[PDB]
Amino acid sequence: DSFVIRGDEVRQIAPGQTGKIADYNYKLPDDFTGCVIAWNSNNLDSKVG
Amino acid sequence: STASALGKLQNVVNQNAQALNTLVKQLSSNFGAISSVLNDILSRLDPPE
């Protein structure tokens, strides 16, 4: 599963986490098994306009 | 006239009653949790802890 979010919000992407994105956009199960990958895109996904 | 001639049967009755009573009394203990009642724990914390 792929998407884009800000720098501060990546901490919300974890099992048993509460916040704003974790409960209204993407919710992970408490007993999640797997892995999470996050990398920077400020030089590609950020626009001057 | 004389009492305390039937110590054995009274002793048996007392032992049974005392064991049951302490078993019931053990419900109020904490065992290191934050409270002795499930409702408060459920209504004051999120699932993870």
Resolution of the model in angstroms: 2.9
Q: What is the rounded distance in angstroms from the CA atom of residue B18 to the CA atom of residue A26?
A: 55
Region for residue A37 given its phi and psi (left: phi exceeds 0; alpha: psi -120 to 50; beta: otherwise): beta
Interface of B to A at Cβ within 8 Å reads 46-48
CA nearest B48: which of A21, A22, A23, A18?
A18
A48 token code pair:
């001057």
Interface of A to B at Cβ within 8 Å reads 16, 18, 30
Cβ–Cβ pairs < 8 A, chains A and B: 6
B43, B45, B46, B49 alpha-carbon torsion, rounded to 10°: -130
